[PDB]
Write an enzyme that holds these catalytic residues in place. Structure first.
Site, mmCIF file in Angstrom:
data_model
loop_
_atom_site.group_PDB
_atom_site.id
_atom_site.type_symbol
_atom_site.label_atom_id
_atom_site.label_comp_id
_atom_site.label_asym_id
_atom_site.label_seq_id
_atom_site.Cartn_x
_atom_site.Cartn_y
_atom_site.Cartn_z
ATOM 1 N N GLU A 118 0.861 -0.839 0.066
ATOM 2 C CA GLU A 118 -0.025 0.431 -0.049
ATOM 3 C C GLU A 118 0.737 1.253 0.160
ATOM 4 O OE1 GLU A 118 -2.658 0.455 -0.870
ATOM 5 O OE2 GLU A 118 -3.766 -1.752 -0.102
ATOM 6 N N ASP A 169 -6.315 6.415 -5.001
ATOM 7 C CA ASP A 169 -5.610 5.215 -5.569
ATOM 8 C C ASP A 169 -5.736 4.233 -6.821
ATOM 9 O OD1 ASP A 169 -8.570 2.615 -4.278
ATOM 10 O OD2 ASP A 169 -8.612 3.904 -5.592
#
Ligand SMILES: [Cl-]
Ligand SMILES: [Cl-]
Ligand SMILES: [K+]
Length: 164
Positions: free
Chosen positions: A11, A20
């Protein structure tokens, strides 16, 4: 290696609101803020999550705190899930992390859709499961991460995360 380190690698860490891979507003270690396209919405969600006026930016401590809560929730979610719990219970400690990784990424519902793969993992047919897991939008959209996770399910080891 452990789930935290593993997720921290997949991440990354950003202290300012970012989009994202799917274009959703996110912050910290992959902490999704909202699916809405309003930065304002995202900004509200942030303040609400942290408990103060952040104006889009947080501290590392704050990011890590959000991170602990999110892993905790993923786990608790798996355990409360009738399709997920059996699988997770059948798995060794390394492979369990691979399952948690998927749930963190895709959510409880999404993973629970990998029905055929779930059964294969439960039967411990590693190579077969890996092939099945690859036949997915998940693999096609984020192949490098998907490779690491599938390799983890296939091998029971952290190889895929070593040398990163
Ligand atoms: Cl929250
Ligand atoms: Cl990727
Ligand atoms: K177990």
């Amino acid at each position: 290696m452990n789930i935290f380190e593993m997720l921290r690698i997949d991440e990354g860490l950003r202290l300012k609101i970012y989009k994202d891979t799917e274009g959703y507003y996110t912050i910290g270690i992959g902490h999704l803020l909202t699916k809405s396209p309003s930065l304002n919405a995202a900004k509200s969600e942030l303040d609400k999550a942290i408990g103060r006026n952040c104006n889009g930016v947080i501290t590392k401590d704050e990011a890590e705190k959000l991170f602990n809560q999110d892993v905790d929730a993923a786990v608790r979610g798996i355990l409360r899930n009738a399709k997920l719990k059996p699988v997770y219970d059948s798995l060794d400690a390394v492979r369990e992390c691979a399952l948690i990784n998927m749930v963190f990424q895709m959510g409880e519902t999404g993973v629970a859709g990998f029905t055929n793969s779930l059964r294969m993992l439960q039967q411990k047919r590693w190579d077969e499961a890996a092939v099945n897991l690859a036949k997915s939008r998940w693999y096609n959209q984020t192949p490098n991460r998907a490779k690491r996770v599938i390799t983890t399910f296939r091998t029971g080891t952290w190889d895929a995360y070593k040398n990163l």
